[PDB]
C-alpha cells in the first residue's frame, strides 16, 4: 500500500532529533511498556498475528493523522487492536466500551493473573525467534551481478517494496534464499515463499543525484523482472 508509512525519499519531515544514547529513554509512560507486552505476548501465542507481516499491515492501515501523532507505541496499540478484532479474538463493540471505561476512569483496576506456563512460552518465543526462511523446489530467477528491473507495481494491500525503488534498475547483490512472502502472508493468504534478494541501487538511478551514495534493499523475486 502506498501509505503514509512509506516515507523513503520524502522531503519536509525536518531535522533528525539527535539525542545522546545515555539520555535516549526507552519508555516515558507505562502504557508504552504495556504495548510491548501486548505485542510480544499475543504474537508468542499466534493471537491476531503469527509473524510480523500481519502486524505491519495493521500499522500501515492507520489514519495518516494518527500515524503521525500517536507516537511509536501508539502504532503497536493500533495494530494489536486491529488484528485481534480482524481475526475474531476480540469484539469491536466490547473493545470500544472497555476503552471508554478507561478513558473516563483511568485508575480502573487491571485484573491480575499469574500463568507461569504462559511466561515460559513467551520467553521461548523471545529467545527462539521465528525465522521466515523456507525451502522451495524452484531455482532463483536472478543471479548475483544481474541487472534487473524493479517493477512498477502498486499493490493495494501490504508490500515490502518501497515506492522510491519502483520502476528502477538495480543489481543483484545476494540471493538470500526463499522467505515467507509478505504481500500474501500479511493478509493470511499463505506463506507462499519466494526467493529474497538484496539489490543495490545507485543514487543517480533513484534520485538523479550525483554523490557516491547507494541503497541496498531486500526485494522478493516477484517485485522484479529481467532486463
Amino acid at each position: 500500500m502506498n501509505g503514509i508509512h512509506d516515507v523513503g525519499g520524502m522531503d519536509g519531515f525536518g531535522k533528525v532529533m539527535y539525542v545522546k544514547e545515555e539520555e535516549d529513554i526507552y519508555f516515558t509512560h507505562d502504557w508504552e511498556r504495556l504495548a510491548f507486552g501486548l505485542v510480544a505476548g499475543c504474537k508468542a501465542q499466534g493471537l491476531g498475528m503469527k509473524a510480523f507481516d500481519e502486524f505491519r499491515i495493521g500499522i500501515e492501515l492507520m489514519r495518516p493523522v494518527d500515524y503521525l501523532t500517536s507516537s511509536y507505541y501508539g502504532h503497536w496499540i493500533a495494530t494489536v487492536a486491529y488484528n485481534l478484532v480482524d481475526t475474531g479474538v476480540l469484539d469491536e463493540k466490547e473493545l470500544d466500551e472497555r476503552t471508554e471505561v478507561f478513558l473516563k476512569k483511568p485508575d480502573t483496576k487491571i485484573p491480575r493473573r499469574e500463568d507461569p506456563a504462559l511466561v515460559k512460552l513467551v520467553e521461548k518465543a523471545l529467545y527462539d525467534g521465528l525465522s521466515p526462511l523456507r525451502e522451495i523446489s524452484a531455482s532463483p530467477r536472478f543471479k548475483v551481478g544481474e541487472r534487473i528491473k524493479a517493477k512498477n507495481i502498486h499493490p493495494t494491500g501490504h508490500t515490502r517494496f518501497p515506492r522510491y525503488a519502483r520502476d528502477k534498475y538495480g543489481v543483484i547483490d545476494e540471493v538470500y534464499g526463499a522467505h515467507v512472502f509478505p504481500d500474501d502472508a500479511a493478509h493470511r493468504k499463505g506463506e507462499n515463499p519466494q526467493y529474497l534478494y538484496r539489490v543495490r541501487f545507485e543514487a543517480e538511478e533513484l534520485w538523479g543525484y550525483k554523490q557516491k551514495d547507494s541503497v541496498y534493499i531486500d526485494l522478493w523475486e516477484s517485485y522484479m523482472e529481467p532486463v
Binding site: 533528525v16 532529533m17 472497555r98 483511568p106 480502573t108 526462511l133 551514495d213 531486500d218
Partner: protein
C-alpha cells in the same frame, strides 16, 4: 467535529493509553494473557537486552583477527554461536566500515532493528525524518549527527525491507593501543553500530 473533516482530528495520546489498558484487561479476563507474561516481556526489552551485546562483538572483532574473519564470512552462524539470537535477530548480517566505505542502516518502512544484538532502536530511528531522508541525502543526515564525510567516501544505506538485519562494524579509533578487549568494548557506541557515528579516540 465537522463530519466533512474527521481526518483533521488525531486521536489524543490518552486514547492510545486507554486502548492499551482495555486490551490488557480484556485479554487477561479471557485467559489470553497474564500479568506475569506481560511483565516478562517488559523486563526483557527494557533491561535484559541492550547495545552492550553488539559492543562485545565489535571489540572481539577488533582484538581477534580470526574471529573478525569468521564474523564477516558467516555472521549468522557466528552470532548464533555467541547466543545473540532471538526475536527480530534470527538473521543478522555485519558490514564493515572502511576508509572509503561508510555503512548506514535504516528501516524506511517502519523500525526494524536487531533487538537481540542491539536492544531497542534509538528514538529518532523510528521517526519519519531519519527514515525519509537517510536513503536520499545520507550526507545531510550524517552531518546532523556530527559526521561530515568527504565526497570521496562512498555511502551504502541498508534499508531493512525484509527480516534480514544488519549491524555496522565501525573502525577502531586511534589512541587505543594497549587497551583490553573489555576496555575497547566500552568505547563502542550504539550509534556507531547503526552507522550514524564514528568512534572517537579516547
Amino acid at each position: 467535529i465537522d463530519p466533512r473533516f474527521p481526518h483533521h482530528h488525531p486521536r489524543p495520546q490518552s486514547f492510545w493509553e486507554a486502548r492499551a489498558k482495555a486490551l490488557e484487561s480484556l485479554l487477561i479476563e479471557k485467559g489470553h494473557l497474564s500479568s506475569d507474561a506481560i511483565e516478562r516481556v517488559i523486563k526483557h526489552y527494557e533491561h535484559e537486552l541492550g547495545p552492550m551485546n553488539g559492543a562485545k562483538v565489535v571489540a572481539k572483532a577488533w582484538t581477534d583477527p580470526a574471529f573478525k574473519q569468521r564474523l564477516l564470512e558467516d555472521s549468522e552462524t557466528v552470532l548464533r554461536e555467541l547466543g545473540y539470537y532471538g526475536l527480530q535477530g534470527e538473521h543478522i548480517r555485519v558490514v564493515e566500515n572502511t576508509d572509503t566505505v561508510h555503512n548506514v542502516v535504516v528501516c524506511t518502512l517502519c523500525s526494524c532493528y536487531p533487538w537481540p544484538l542491539l536492544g531497542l532502536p534509538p528514538s529518532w530511528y523510528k521517526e519519519p525524518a531519519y527514515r525519509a531522508r537517510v536513503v536520499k541525502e545520507p550526507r545531510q543526515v550524517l552531518k546532523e549527527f556530527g559526521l561530515d564525510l568527504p565526497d570521496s567516501v562512498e555511502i551504502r544505506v541498508w534499508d531493512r525491507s525484509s527480516e534480514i538485519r544488519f549491524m555496522v562494524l565501525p573502525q577502531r579509533p586511534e589512541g587505543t593501543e594497549g587497551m583490553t578487549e573489555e576496555e575497547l568494548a566500552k568505547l563502542v557506541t550504539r550509534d556507531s553500530m547503526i552507522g550514524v557515528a564514528k568512534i572517537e579516540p579516547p
